[PDB]
Design an enzyme around this catalytic site. Sequence first.
Site, PDB file in Angstrom:
ATOM      1  N   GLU A  35       0.805  -1.215   0.000  1.00 35.27           N
ATOM      2  CA  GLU A  35       0.000   0.000   0.000  1.00 35.27           C
ATOM      3  C   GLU A  35       0.839   1.267   0.000  1.00 35.27           C
ATOM      4  O   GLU A  35       0.530   2.205  -0.739  1.00 35.27           O
ATOM      5  CB  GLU A  35      -0.946   0.019   1.208  1.00 35.27           C
ATOM      6  CG  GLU A  35      -2.145  -0.920   1.086  1.00 35.27           C
ATOM      7  CD  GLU A  35      -3.287  -0.332   0.276  1.00 35.27           C
ATOM      8  OE1 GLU A  35      -3.123   0.771  -0.285  1.00 35.27           O
ATOM      9  OE2 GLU A  35      -4.357  -0.975   0.205  1.00 35.27           O
ATOM     10  N   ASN A  46      -7.661   9.451  -5.279  1.00 32.37           N
ATOM     11  CA  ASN A  46      -8.582   8.505  -5.893  1.00 32.37           C
ATOM     12  C   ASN A  46      -9.447   9.210  -6.933  1.00 32.37           C
ATOM     13  O   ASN A  46      -9.512  10.439  -7.000  1.00 32.37           O
ATOM     14  CB  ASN A  46      -9.454   7.828  -4.830  1.00 32.37           C
ATOM     15  CG  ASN A  46      -8.642   7.009  -3.850  1.00 32.37           C
ATOM     16  OD1 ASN A  46      -8.816   7.117  -2.636  1.00 32.37           O
ATOM     17  ND2 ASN A  46      -7.736   6.190  -4.372  1.00 32.37           N
ATOM     18  N   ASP A  48     -12.683   9.281  -7.182  1.00 32.84           N
ATOM     19  CA  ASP A  48     -13.916   9.866  -6.670  1.00 32.84           C
ATOM     20  C   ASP A  48     -13.685  11.132  -5.856  1.00 32.84           C
ATOM     21  O   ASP A  48     -14.652  11.703  -5.339  1.00 32.84           O
ATOM     22  CB  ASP A  48     -14.691   8.838  -5.836  1.00 32.84           C
ATOM     23  CG  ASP A  48     -13.887   8.293  -4.670  1.00 32.84           C
ATOM     24  OD1 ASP A  48     -12.688   8.617  -4.557  1.00 32.84           O
ATOM     25  OD2 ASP A  48     -14.461   7.528  -3.865  1.00 32.84           O
ATOM     26  N   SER A  50     -11.526  11.442  -3.128  1.00 35.38           N
ATOM     27  CA  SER A  50     -10.943  11.197  -1.821  1.00 35.38           C
ATOM     28  C   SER A  50      -9.445  10.934  -1.967  1.00 35.38           C
ATOM     29  O   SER A  50      -8.885  10.960  -3.066  1.00 35.38           O
ATOM     30  CB  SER A  50     -11.651  10.036  -1.124  1.00 35.38           C
ATOM     31  OG  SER A  50     -11.623   8.863  -1.916  1.00 35.38           O
ATOM     32  N   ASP A  52      -6.059   8.565  -0.099  1.00 34.53           N
ATOM     33  CA  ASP A  52      -5.530   7.593   0.845  1.00 34.53           C
ATOM     34  C   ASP A  52      -4.298   8.171   1.527  1.00 34.53           C
ATOM     35  O   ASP A  52      -3.474   8.831   0.888  1.00 34.53           O
ATOM     36  CB  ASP A  52      -5.171   6.290   0.130  1.00 34.53           C
ATOM     37  CG  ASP A  52      -6.376   5.616  -0.494  1.00 34.53           C
ATOM     38  OD1 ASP A  52      -7.404   5.472   0.199  1.00 34.53           O
ATOM     39  OD2 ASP A  52      -6.298   5.237  -1.683  1.00 34.53           O
ATOM     40  N   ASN A  59      -8.517   5.843   3.765  1.00 36.01           N
ATOM     41  CA  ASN A  59      -9.298   6.668   2.852  1.00 36.01           C
ATOM     42  C   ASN A  59     -10.023   7.784   3.594  1.00 36.01           C
ATOM     43  O   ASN A  59     -10.559   7.577   4.685  1.00 36.01           O
ATOM     44  CB  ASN A  59     -10.310   5.805   2.096  1.00 36.01           C
ATOM     45  CG  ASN A  59     -10.786   6.453   0.815  1.00 36.01           C
ATOM     46  OD1 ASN A  59     -11.964   6.772   0.669  1.00 36.01           O
ATOM     47  ND2 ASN A  59      -9.872   6.643  -0.127  1.00 36.01           N
ATOM     48  N   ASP A 101     -14.852  -3.627  10.533  1.00 34.07           N
ATOM     49  CA  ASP A 101     -16.030  -3.041   9.908  1.00 34.07           C
ATOM     50  C   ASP A 101     -16.832  -4.049   9.092  1.00 34.07           C
ATOM     51  O   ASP A 101     -17.638  -3.649   8.245  1.00 34.07           O
ATOM     52  CB  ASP A 101     -15.623  -1.856   9.032  1.00 34.07           C
ATOM     53  CG  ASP A 101     -16.675  -0.773   8.996  1.00 34.07           C
ATOM     54  OD1 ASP A 101     -16.882  -0.112  10.034  1.00 34.07           O
ATOM     55  OD2 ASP A 101     -17.291  -0.579   7.928  1.00 34.07           O
TER      56      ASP A 101
END
Length: 129
Positions: A35, A46, A48, A50, A52, A59, A101
């Site tokens: 990562e 990203n 959209d 957002s 990281d 995120n 989650d």
Amino acid sequence: KVFGRCELAAAMKRHGLDNYRGYSLGNWVCAAKFESNFNTQATNRNTDGSTDYGILQINSRWWCNDGRTPGSRNLCNIPCSALLSSDITASVNCAKKIVSDGNGMNAWVAWRNRCKGTDVQAWIRGCRL
């Protein structure tokens, strides 16, 4: 800070990540390498809108706040810049809430595609643990 392999595994073990939710230490170290390449200051935009952040690329849409993701949540209750520190304490606590989650480690697309099903133990190779 760009961690060393066995240096990062020691700090994650000290913060309670080893076998957290049934995920061995070699899994978390594997996800870090794929990562952020062990670099604490890694950031990636990203599609959209957002971003990281951090050693495990958390995120901004859901977890941290960067003030530039509209319609976002701040579940980890931190500024995303706190995820870029030489101390992985903020990134470790926020990831504990992510892996809890529902979907487990699948929330990290790099782990599912490059670590899941592999010999993760080979990442704590020769580490003084």
